[PDB]
Design a protein around this ligand. Structure first.
Ligand SMILES: [Mg+2]
Ligand SMILES: [Mg+2]
Ligand SMILES: [Mg+2]
Ligand SMILES: [Mg+2]
Ligand SMILES: [Mg+2]
Ligand SMILES: [Mg+2]
Ligand SMILES: [Mg+2]
Ligand SMILES: [Mg+2]
Ligand SMILES: [Mg+2]
Ligand SMILES: [Mg+2]
Ligand SMILES: [Mg+2]
Ligand SMILES: [Mg+2]
Ligand SMILES: [Mg+2]
Ligand SMILES: [Mg+2]
Ligand SMILES: [Mg+2]
Ligand SMILES: [Mg+2]
Lengths: 48, 217, 117, 203
RNA sequence: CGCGACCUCAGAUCAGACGUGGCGACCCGCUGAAUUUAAGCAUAUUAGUCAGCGGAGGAAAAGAAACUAACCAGGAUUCCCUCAGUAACGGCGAGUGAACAGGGAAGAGCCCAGCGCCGAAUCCCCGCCCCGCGGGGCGCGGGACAUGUGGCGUACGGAAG
RNA sequence: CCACCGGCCCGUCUCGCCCGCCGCGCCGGGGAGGUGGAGCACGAGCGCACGUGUUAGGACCCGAAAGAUGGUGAACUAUG
RNA sequence: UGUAGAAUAAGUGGGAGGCCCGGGCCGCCGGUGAAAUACCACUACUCUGAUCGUUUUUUCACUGACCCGGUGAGGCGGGGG
């Protein structure tokens, strides 16, 4: 989760979701995990 | 990294690049430039782009067209007053090498009859094929009205071997709707060639003749 | 009671050996605004409840006299725990090397002082 | 009220607060013996949802097992068979390690009855389970008639007939299209009814 | 330094109670070949069986869907006839081999963790009476379990107020 | 009943034009030939029993050198 | 930095005008070659330069997991004499 937040913070959602597909089971759970990490990262570093 | 080909973001970028520095107004009638930067191509083997894009609104100048041949075709050339030159003065163009490029730079688009394409790369050899301006072969008794009408608007999409291509799509004294319609007729050749999507364009630049560059939103 | 905001004062014992039984309570009382105090000796909470281990004591309701004493306690407890929570949450406790090794590194530091000055 | 927070704090077990406790407990349980009697459970809610009601007679054992799929016991790699069976190094031994721990705890203390078990720790080689044991002849369990089923004598040694939670999951029984392999009772009962060639008086 | 409280623990010919060993025809959990077949033989087959080990009762196991289906839908488990020598597996060879629909036999559903409400309203042990036999069960005082969670109300068909 | 021709259904192939319209379409239906089929072309099965033959079963009877599983032996002999 | 061109031509494409205060400079023309600049945009390698970082490799180092020895676990490390 911590290194996926860095990769989805800077680089690319494609590489991020490919890493999540490697680490958890399949593509659907990877989609929800991606959206949850995107919401958490957006709330954290857009809450100023 | 985000890129659309959407109409209002095309037209808004046209309005921004026109309104840049107030009106960057100088004594020449400004032309509109389009740069396409492309991604994920290998034209080293089999990926060169070369076609004829006929811009529907207006191609700045009514193009300087020179036709070489002889028949009723050349009588219609003298009827339209297309600058047409005969066999004897072609063999006069044989005699000097710079005399080839004196008629090549002053006249933009080259059309030539079917009968003379055997002779033309002997006289006009070093100029046209190496510079890119080799003439187009024609029908022996063709109606030149529709040919000149299409050649007035037909530019060439030649991405060569390099990764990037700029073309002029008209002038600023046109309406901006005609300008954005020329930009759509430019990008339609990209979406017609490429198989997957328009994602080979991460960024394409809209410019004036010398105005500031605008990334397409 | 802390969820439904009835608790005036939450007493948390120190010595709970599965600490998972407790470790939600400080941040939870921090969110819900109820002041909490960590007191040492979980057997010492048992002698007031007639039992061995007690782990937690809730204060919700007070008598007439004890209100001023309870508020006097709550003021110092809010000074200690709740208002310093953002301070406490970033401290990493421990990381203390063995005293023989600390003495050896300090002796080598005196050797470094002998090399320099 | 608070066991929900207990369960959720134990739920995301890879975070930094819990894995310190897990590492300390793995070292703690590795330095002790193989089987002994913890006085009280280390996962109170998870032991409680398996049936631990903290009263007189519910014992908690902590038990330790070694990891790894089993090695075939033939000497010097000599199977004496076809090339199907020469594979000494790679067999996995169907039963789960949780049911192995339940077997060892029960047959070390055969006087008790095994209710269930759960995970508490692992580091490299040793894997750690805690097993709840119900006393059969204490009066607190021989009364209270919701509980008398384990005192009923058909439940001697549930762990070796595989009636526990890990036992059912090892035997592989459910319903539906993913379980035609054992149609009724067990795979041997299914095999019995399918290959028993049935013959009536009239044919 | 002493004392006290727990927490981890040991000891005892401590008070009381329990497990071991057998028979194994049927059942349950694991382990597990090879003859043979294929005209040879390596996968296959013999078979997840003989042998081995551990368990259990008069039955055991299974069981109230993380189901079957795809249309006018059925409805825990078990057993029989059909499905069917079929779909399928297989040096696609020898051979292997189901299941839901259908009709019968039997008919049965339930509880707890969680959640919250009830002042621990709960249980065990000891001691005195209580009572009537063939023989043991309710009530009253003091020692414990237990607040790291007894009991009542409560289960996904909704439940509580 | 035999022999042949003609007919019909299904799969494919070839050549062709017409019709239908719960919706006008890379939609259906159709025609004429030559072919593959365990077909139709007024149905003959099903159940029982007996006989013969073939196959799987210890299978007409007896027969091996082998292989696997699990155990019992160092009282003769071998060597500490 | 093959050759020619005043000029190390990476490339495309617009292109007769651009820059600035009646005017000058650059470009056009001449001329090169096969391809020519002004003004303008992108696409590249060849190196330099800084860190929210990033990772693994390497270098040493500490000990608390783990391992190795010895004891009837007998004086260990600091600080005082
Ligand atoms: Mg106890
Ligand atoms: Mg059961
Ligand atoms: Mg028959
Ligand atoms: Mg033979
Ligand atoms: Mg042989
Ligand atoms: Mg098999
Ligand atoms: Mg046997
Ligand atoms: Mg026995
Ligand atoms: Mg019996
Ligand atoms: Mg249910
Ligand atoms: Mg049949
Ligand atoms: Mg089989
Ligand atoms: Mg053999
Ligand atoms: Mg042998
Ligand atoms: Mg043997
Ligand atoms: Mg002897």
């Amino acid at each position: 989760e911590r290194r996926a937040m860095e990769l989805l913070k800077v680089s690319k959602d494609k590489r991020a979701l490919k890493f999540i597909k490697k680490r958890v089971g399949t593509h659907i759970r990877a989609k929800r995990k991606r959206e949850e990490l995107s919401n958490v990262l957006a709330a954290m570093r857009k809450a100023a | 990294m985000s890129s659309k080909v959407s109409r209002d973001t095309l037209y808004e970028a046209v309005r921004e690049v026109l309104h840049g520095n107030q009106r960057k107004r100088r004594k020449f009638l400004e032309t509109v430039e389009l740069q396409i930067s492309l991604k994920n191509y290998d034209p080293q083997k089999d990926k060169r782009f070369s076609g004829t894009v006929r811009l529907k609104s207006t191609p700045r100048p009514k193009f300087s067209v020179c036709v070489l041949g002889d028949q009723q075709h050349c009588d219609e050339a003298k009827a339209v007053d297309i600058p047409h030159m005969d066999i004897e003065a072609l063999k006069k163009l044989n005699k000097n090498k710079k005399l080839v490029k004196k008629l090549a730079k002053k006249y933009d688009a080259f059309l030539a009859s079917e009968s003379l394409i055997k002779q033309i790369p002997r006289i006009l050899g070093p100029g046209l094929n190496k510079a890119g301006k080799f003439p187009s072969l024609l029908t022996h008794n063709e109606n030149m009205v529709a040919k000149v009408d299409e050649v007035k608007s037909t530019i060439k999409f030649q991405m060569k071997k390099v990764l990037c291509l700029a073309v002029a799509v008209g002038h600023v004294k046109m309406t901006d709707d005609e300008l954005v319609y020329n930009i759509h007729l430019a990008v339609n050749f990209l979406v017609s060639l490429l198989k997957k999507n328009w994602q080979n364009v991460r960024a394409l630049y809209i410019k004036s003749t010398m105005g500031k560059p605008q990334r397409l939103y | 009671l802390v969820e439904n905001k009835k608790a005036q004062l939450v007493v948390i014992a120190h010595d709970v050996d599965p600490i998972e039984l407790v470790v939600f309570l400080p941040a939870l009382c921090r969110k819900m605004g109820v002041p909490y105090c960590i007191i040492k000796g979980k057997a010492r909470l048992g002698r007031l409840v007639h039992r061995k281990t007690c782990t937690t004591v809730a204060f919700t309701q007070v008598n007439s006299e004890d209100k001023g004493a309870l508020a006097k306690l709550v003021e110092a407890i809010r000074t200690n725990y709740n208002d310093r929570y953002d301070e406490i949450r970033r401290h990493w406790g421990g990381n203390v090397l063995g005293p023989k090794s600390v003495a050896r590194i300090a002796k080598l530091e005196k050797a470094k002082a002998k090399e320099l000055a | 009220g608070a066991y929900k927070y207990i369960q959720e704090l134990w739920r995301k077990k890879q975070s930094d607060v819990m894995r310190f406790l897990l590492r300390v407990r793995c070292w703690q349980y590795r330095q002790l013996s193989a089987l002994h009697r913890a006085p009280r459970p280390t996962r109170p809610d998870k032991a409680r949802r398996l049936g631990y009601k903290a009263k007189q007679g519910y014992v908690i054992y902590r038990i330790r097992v070694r990891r790894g799929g089993r090695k075939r016991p033939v000497p010097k790699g000599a199977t004496y068979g076809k090339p199907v069976h020469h594979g000494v190094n790679q067999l996995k031994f169907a039963r789960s390690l949780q049911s192995v721990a339940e077997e060892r705890a029960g047959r070390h203390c055969g006087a008790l009855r095994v209710l269930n078990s759960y995970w508490v720790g692992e580091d490299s080689t040793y894997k750690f389970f805690e097993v709840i044991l119900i006393d059969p002849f204490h009066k607190a369990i021989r009364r209270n008639p919701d509980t008398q089923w384990i005192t009923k004598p058909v439940h001697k040694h549930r762990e070796m007939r595989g009636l526990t939670s890990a036992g059912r999951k090892s035997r592989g029984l459910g319903k539906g299209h993913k379980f035609h392999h054992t149609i009724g009772g067990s795979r041997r009962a299914a095999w019995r009814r399918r290959n028993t060639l049935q013959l009536h008086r009239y044919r």
